[PDB]
Amino acid sequence: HGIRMTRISREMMKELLSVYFIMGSNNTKADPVTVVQKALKGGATLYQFREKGGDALTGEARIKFAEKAQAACREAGVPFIVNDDVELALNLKADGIHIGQEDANAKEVRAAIGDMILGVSAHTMSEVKQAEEDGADYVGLGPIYPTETKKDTRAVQGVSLIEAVRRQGISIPIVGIGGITIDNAAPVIQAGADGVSMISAISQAEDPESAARKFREEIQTYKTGR
């Protein structure tokens, strides 16, 4: 994953979304970079650096943590995505950026980042369509199941929006998010998603490596079987 000179293809985008681990320092009681390393070794296919709120790091300390997480992703051969912070993404030469409905407007972010990967969180059909017309490479849909990791979430929607987007014939890359565990991931893939994303199911696991590996095995099975 080098410096891109073309938009990512939908085929490659959908492969990367399979097991999409998201983490910051306030999401684990263990050493944060160690947790990221273990998730990548077990099989996460994409990583998002999300360091915000709670007792998150700030300043130089947050930047130095991001550089260590990015180096972990380079050693594993997995792309590094930054949540929210367009300037950090550009300064680190991240592989991409994830934004939501209250963040910078997708059209302006797509202008600022060239051919980097762009993800948008969406909760409704118009928001998916808008994200696609704005130049997103994928959408994050949810919350599928109840979750407390992110404070301010929208209402729990199950797989309803995923099915509705596939019914309207839209083929954009989709990752499901919100309260996903190894026990409830399969239906997200059966409804038509290209992957699952998680924080707690991996970051707070007794054994994050084995948790990542089990997700990778299960998601592969269900993508072939739907």
Footprint on this chain of ligand TPS (rule: CB under 6 A):
22, 48, 50, 83, 98, 119, 121, 140, 142-143, 147, 149-150, 153, 175, 177-180, 197-201
Known binder of ligand: residue 121?
yes
Q: Known catalytic residue: 223?
A: no
Work out how close the CB of 11 gets to ligand TPS at its nearest, in angstroms, rounded to a whole number: 19
* Residue 103 partner contact from Mg ion, ligand TPS, none using kind-dependent CB cut-offs of 5 to 8 Å: Mg ion
What are the DSSP E strand ranges found in the chain?
19-23, 46-49, 80-83, 96-99, 117-122, 138-141, 174-177, 195-198
Q: Known catalytic residue: 154?
A: no
Which residue ranges make up the site for Mg ion (CB under 5 A)? 84, 100, 103
Q: Known catalytic residue: 150?
A: yes
Indicate the residue among 124 and 190 with the shorter CB distance to Mg ion.
Answer: 124
Nearest to 156 by CA among 174, 176, 136: 176
Question: Helix H segments across 114-182?
Answer: 125-133, 160-167
For residues 125 and 203, give the distance between their C-alpha atoms in angstroms, rounded to a whole number.
30
Tell how strand 46-49 and strand 195-198 pair up: unpaired
* Residue 130 partner contact from ligand TPS, Mg ion, none using kind-dependent CB cut-offs of 5 to 8 Å: none
For residues 139 and 176, give the distance between their C-alpha atoms in angstroms, rounded to a whole number.
9
Please state the residue numbers annotated as binding site. 48-52, 83-84, 103, 121, 147-150, 179, 199-200
List active site positions. Answer: 50, 121, 150
